[model samples]
Target chain A: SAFEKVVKNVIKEVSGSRGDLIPVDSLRNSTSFRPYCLLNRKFSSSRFWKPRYSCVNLSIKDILEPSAVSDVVDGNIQGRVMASMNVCILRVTQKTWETMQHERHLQQPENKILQQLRSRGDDLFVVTEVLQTKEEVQITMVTIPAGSILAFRVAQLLIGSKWDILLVSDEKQRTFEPSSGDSLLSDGIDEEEADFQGLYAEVKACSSELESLEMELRQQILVNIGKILQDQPSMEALEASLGQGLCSGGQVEPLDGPAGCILECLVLDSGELVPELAAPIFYLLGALAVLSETQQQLLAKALETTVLSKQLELVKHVLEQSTPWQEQSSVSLPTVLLGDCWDEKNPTWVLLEECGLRVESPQVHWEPTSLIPTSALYASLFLLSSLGQ
Target chain B: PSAFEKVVKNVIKEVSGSRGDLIPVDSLRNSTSFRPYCLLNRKFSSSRFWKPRYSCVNLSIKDILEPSAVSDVVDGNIQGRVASMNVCILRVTQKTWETMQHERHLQQPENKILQQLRSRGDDLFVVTEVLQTKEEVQIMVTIPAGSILAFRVAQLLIGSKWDILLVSDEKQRTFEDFQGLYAEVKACSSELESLEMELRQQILVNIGKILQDQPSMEALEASLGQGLCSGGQVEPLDGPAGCILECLVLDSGELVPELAAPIFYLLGALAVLSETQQQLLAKALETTVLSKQLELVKHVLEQSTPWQEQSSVSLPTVLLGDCWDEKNPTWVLLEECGLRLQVESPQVHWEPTSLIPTSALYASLFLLSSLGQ
Candidate 1:
């Protein structure tokens, strides 16, 4: 009712004015009634009510005389309309949406490609474009789990730029490509393609080689530990102790005689082992020693064991225990004697005695012929004096 | 699109979790029923006004002492009156009131002693009497407020750890004292030394910024034509060249045009010039025309102009012109001829002319006559 009254009043006012400058103040004074009329009046109806006085008295032609002004206005209007239309189209399309369910299924090896793309998302294409522009670009891709792709993406984004682009290549099979190369080139196709292929091959080869090498390395390391144990004296003593403490039945070898010559042969046959596998190999050998003791004792009680088989089992037990000690104590005397000579200037023979040795007779000695032969004593004192007080 | 949507969903999830960021402890407190005002009211009631009702005295004491009936009646009346009155009032004569007020006003300068005693009532007076003996033991030390004694005593008793010495002097006065003494000494000694060092650093920085910001030589060459003519060289005049040459020969004195005079003067005066002024001077002097004009003016003035103010100007006009022509023209002409003679020269010379004989002659004549006896 209020809107209708406002429209009728505004029409009556305009009709009464006929044609002249309509004061903005007069319109504002009646603003409580005017705006309602303006908003409610239909466009077609308003056109019918148009009068000569409807036009404001202003020089529009003068204000927009310049060509630049018209160009600017046209550009502004065009841009506004284009933006509005684009926004409207997007809105409408969004409103009329259909459910989209996308499931990517790729063939075995080729499926890795889709995985790589999915992992990289937008960065893959960006990096691909960057690397594709270089003359000789070397790309290295590291594959990780699918879940870790997000973390890698964030890391790449933080460190990425136009010149240095990092991209995730594969998701399922962990892969990444870092784009870095010389920019000055007419065409980078051959170099880039070769680099890509070479990189792929290298990565694949490295993965397989690492796996096999790790396994072989593990076995080699275990063998080396076994060899080390065979050469150890403390291990021999331990084995003897265990053998005596735990009876080996009829399989027990005589502890009084020297160890068999076959021990050295067995050591020589054992393959080399890596340093990392020593501890586990020692543990395994220790377990075997226990088991052999148990078996040997059973056989000894029964008195039906083959002599060769019993001797081999006893040798095996001794070898397992004695190897570690032999390896450990082989250089102890020499090491201690050298250390004592450096620190206390003691004779190597005396140093060996101090290290708790009970040798029958002296085997070797390093002796000085004179106190100051060739003035060596004086030279030594001089050098030591210059080093400190 | 699926990947993008997944990212969008992840972001939304993150933001939802982060909504807790906006909700603070204050908001949580606001949601609770226990308000600060309620706690404050409860605290006030528990401490100040609220009290438990109790008998003024035990009636059993009066009842058990049956022989003191008369004394009991008098005590009962006193207790009942005391209980009836909410506060104790001691009605004193006008003279006593005046004396008490005067004693209290003397005891406490803040003038609230009487009012405070009245507020505490008779019990407070009894406590005061008990403490009166102890008051005599207090040493009557009169220390003015804001004095070191007052400050120290207040700090000790009140557990205040203020740096009292800082409060003794005003900041502006302290600053002024420093400015008048230590700052003056420092300024006279090493302040200028540091300033000079900083000035040198600023100059270097400004030069570097200029060098980096400026376009390369190629761009400069492109903007300013490669073969443009420059410098103050003689254009062909409509007079006889021999006449100008004869005049120049007569004026010749020095072997070279004195170009160093103005440059030296400018450099010497540069201490007074601001950076903008120095830049203006440098730009003005960069032009060969200005440089040559300055050189001619300096040489003529130096050689011919009289230092004594009252001297007459009578030197031959031709002699002054001869000096400028013989040295400057010959040097320039030789350079031009050398360039022409060379089999290979890189492009054209920016300065192609030899001298402006007419202007040189006029200036020389003016200088010579001004200096002549």
Candidate 2:
């Protein structure tokens, strides 16, 4: 009774009566009290699978003005049958949902897809499904079986945790970093920024730590994965953090995230991306691709406009423009390692990443890159070692 | 007719059943190397490799077990055998046998009959065995056919790192497939090791549960004879292999000696059916004799198991002299199992010891003793 007041008020607030579902109190009587009742009343099981959840990991961008989220939201609706993947509406803050409601009305153009809270029974709302949204109003959630999503997120968190913890200790050793300035000037005056001073040594520290950490973490990763499989509810509490990046592109972050700096520092220890690491890159890209439909469509649109290989043209364009390594002593970075397959599980993401390197066929080995962050390298190891675990 | 010969026929048949994965029980009963004392020797568990094949952590057989030997062993027969077996892994080499304080001599006479085991083509060994003969055999290691190899390889470079080039891709696809098969075997062997160890640990913990209540024991044993070997495989944990370890504690149980093969893949991939039981199965396992039956188990555990590393809990026992009185069937299963089991939050909390845990002390002694051995 209190929730639709939310729906009623949202429409009331919509004033324009954006076709929001009518108060419709009787519909509540007809609907089942439990969400599962509606879901299961039909069949004990479903042959269909929804991409599992409906919640979005909210973003500052989602709530921001020119409304990058709205733009992406509107963009996501680009040229489709308006299929019922719609779990629910998002961006419902006193500040944002009003515009999103208007966007749905205006954007639905053909159908006027109204925001819904079809009462199933006295108090039952849509049995399950967290009112899927690019933006959540009242703690909306990714509603399908997030057990899998939570597992992966837990994986990312572990890696990120490892990265952050290592970074904390690493900060002292890394006196002058590329992104940091005093380090740039001081390194100009100080010794090898005194960090690697040996350059190669710094590279080793990065790769070696990743190697060791992965070697160690797989046991833990396997164990946690085991825990995740059997004890899924354990992560029920972390569901909130999950939506923060659901459709998000791995939070690769704007421009200055440590990755860029992480990439710049590798000199000699870096090498061509090892073929061994390619599958992981493909897998990660696929993981991100699977996170959201809009992102999937975003990936689809990107592939549609440019030839997949041509996207690499853009990367190539940047690389050539980028600086040459080891100008004096002629030491080169080891190939960067990205790791696996373009298997059906996640073809588009792999397609895009695999596009330029041009290893179209598995038979043809991929060209390796020479850029990897030290922390990221370790994080990636967690994934690799996880294979056996 | 004689025990050794009888066992020899058994071993020969066992070797044949294993497809030449022969049991080294060649001289176990009466022969001089009886001192080698098959599985009882702590050294028996060490990694077998060549002068150069740094497969299992580069640690030599002596290097691995002597450490453990320093601290533990009520089973000194193991000590005597390591000293006596004339295992003569060289009986050679500029007497690299420098460590041998005992006068080195051939424990077996030249007329001794040796079984030329057909290698599965992989025993985690890079060193190859070309021919089997009594006269001066070089470049060693002869693992019982079914011995499981521990896996950890980024392309196995065996036997002194030199065999690397020989086993390259240019070789036959059959050879390549062979290596892949070996890797797969090694990979899961470690897992079985852990599983078996966990099962052993569970037995100790739940012994009281099964034996303390004769009814539950009978309840289980009644179901046991009917279902036979297939009866009691529990999941132990929620995930992969549960913690409710599948235990077969036979101080005196209904199981046949055949069930013992997989029980002791010697990797502890199998259960330790008391030393006496170890001998019975050791005797029964040779040829096609018990092979059909034991496959019931070896095949099962091997299939479901995988490798995970940590370690386990060990043995020595006196039969319940009192309890075995005319009252309870003296044949009542061995009573050395376990107590209360609470898998909930199931962990040791592993507090540091004021004086090291026995195993810990053993580990330290293991390292130190390696010097003298």
Candidate 3:
């Protein structure tokens, strides 16, 4: 009916223009200024020429444009950082991040000085000891340069309690590490610094390596399955929507916040295959398989957030209603037509029902975000049609 | 004697090969059934370029054991009883070959033959006669080595006389010309009514037999080559089978180069499978094999290729290795594990020689197991 027409248009409407950025002065700060030894040693050993490089302190709110799901205000509702510009991330200790938060709070009290400083265009630098980490707390300062937008988005999404970082964009993004053997040959280095640098490289490689390898295998396997199942009507619809560039980065990028968390719990972390998750896994594989490599990464970056045990509960509900190995069971699906679903819950049915989404079938209703139109639900129907018989 | 007479006498004597039928050209012309075929343009038709010096003379092997054409000669050639090798040969279009057979009533002029052929625009077959000596006619034609029909035609003309059939260089060669030899072979053999199609089917049957009986990597490799599959030494199947292999199997070299032999065997098994079995394999690919590959890849990353003393192990190698089983591994995994069907138990012991059921899934699993081992 009228709902289906809107459903058709939902993909087109998902990505709207980004709103004007509200630049808060509290967000800007300088690290390593005026003869601080940490500035000289840390900045000098690396490529950064100026000792005092301006940095931006960001919480999830500062980067992401708030959406309906984001406005839910539940402390546990993790989201993606809306990257305004390409920026580099430097991982720092929890203590340093906490101190920065404290300093920012203190700065709010001195409003007149903050306003005067802002007017003076001192937006660039404020050399102080605040940028320096205490010797004891400085365990690992992992610097990741964001050369591509995808790198930036994934890095931003990963910046939760596991780690925190200041955004530095002064120098164009490049690999920042201590001198390799060649560089070491040219410049004599202390043993302590050399060991630390090697550790940084090892840690960085290990973390990204496992993540990338898994993501790669997942996508390739999914794409293979996707190709086999691509003959279906739902797959055809997905191809067209993806082909027309309907599910753009702007619209679906935000949904990655929830989708990423869902991905981690659903597949990434789980060692044993949850039997109940077979359909959702198939659904996710089908949905993600059609995406471009970068889109796949970013979406995975989003779904990595909700990796809690709740994933099994959500999956059981989905499979329970659909019926196992049956042809066309009368399922009480909360049919949140695409557009209404986007408006209400985004893409995930679990998120919607939990976050107050309703719709009427024979009984009255509830609502979703994602590039694919009602991907999970559509796949559910496809499964019924294909496997039911 | 005229130079033409001398040349003809020497070729006949030499091709008669150690029989030493050293008769005079005039006597031989009268004695044998060497009928006049179409004329060959005397000038060099080198490569593709042709500026012919035309002549009216022609010849045939009508009385030379009366091998009519490709149709009458293949059985003898395949059986290896006849003198098939020592022949003067040239490539030609089916149209030209058919025209020669049909137009027994009249001898069309060389220009007329060329003109009629020009309309269809075939890549003219070229055969440069290198008279190494007056005794030898080094019949050289630029047929592709794998052109089975061209070779078969060569066998047919063991003692026959021939003239070149060349299409003009200016005319665009159609797809028919590219597949000219196959088409000609098809027209010649009633057994190969739809040659390429039936050839593929026959090959699939042969490969299915190999998969069921000799299910080993060595047997699979031999299936592709000339070890045992061609039946006997004289009937070399490598040419036609090679053409079919190139078209069907090796075309996917980039994706699964190592698995080519196994995949080729898998294709044979696929051709022999029941429709329901085939559907089961495809479904298993989507449902089970897909996830299994993912799990295998993950296992490789975590355990096989991890930083721990594990040496280099490729993704495909591990995947195939994990699927390996001793006896009825394929039936166990594909039907038992994947389809959840109650598969009949395979042979009791691990005898590699025993013939398994020719199922695509079975072949695939066996091939994978072999690669892993």
- TM-score per prediction, in order, is 0.11, 0.18, 0.16
Model 1 chain B lDDT-worst window of ten: B149-158
Q: Kindly list the per-residue Cα lDDT of model 3 for residues B273-363, writing each as its tens digit.
A: 4444444443443222334543443333333211212123234332344334432334343333223322222212121111123122333
lDDT of 2 by residue, B24-142 (tens): 33333222222111111111111121011221222222222213221111111110011012111101111232233133323232221111111112223221111111222222533
Write down the worst ten-residue block by lDDT for model 3 chain B.
B74-83
What tens-digit string does per-residue lDDT give for candidate 1 at A1-389? Answer: 33233323322221211111122222222221111011110011011011111212221111111311011000000001110110000000111111110111112243332232322221211101100000111123322121110100011111111112123322222112322233465453433332123422322332232233344443343333333333435344333322222221112232222232211211222332221222222222232232223232332232222232332332223222321221221211224322433222333233222222222223222111111111121121111112111
The C-alpha local distance difference test score for the whole of candidate 3 amounts to: 0.28
Is candidate 1 or 2 superior in lDDT? Answer: 2
Model 2 chain B: weakest 10-residue lDDT segment is: B75-84
Local accuracy by lDDT, each model = 0.22, 0.24, 0.28
Question: Interface Cα RMSD for all candidates?
Answer: 48.5, 38.3, 39.7
Candidate 1 runs further than 4 Å off:
A1-219, A223-389, B1-373
lDDT of 2 by residue, A163-208 (tens): 1111111112211111222223432432234111233333333233
The Cα error of candidate 3 at residue A188, in Å, is 63
TM-score of predicted chain B versus true chain B for each candidate: 0.14, 0.18, 0.19
- RMSD of candidate 2 to the truth, in angstroms, is 31.9
- Better model by lDDT, 1 or 3? 3
Residue B293's C-alpha lDDT in candidate 1?
Answer: 46
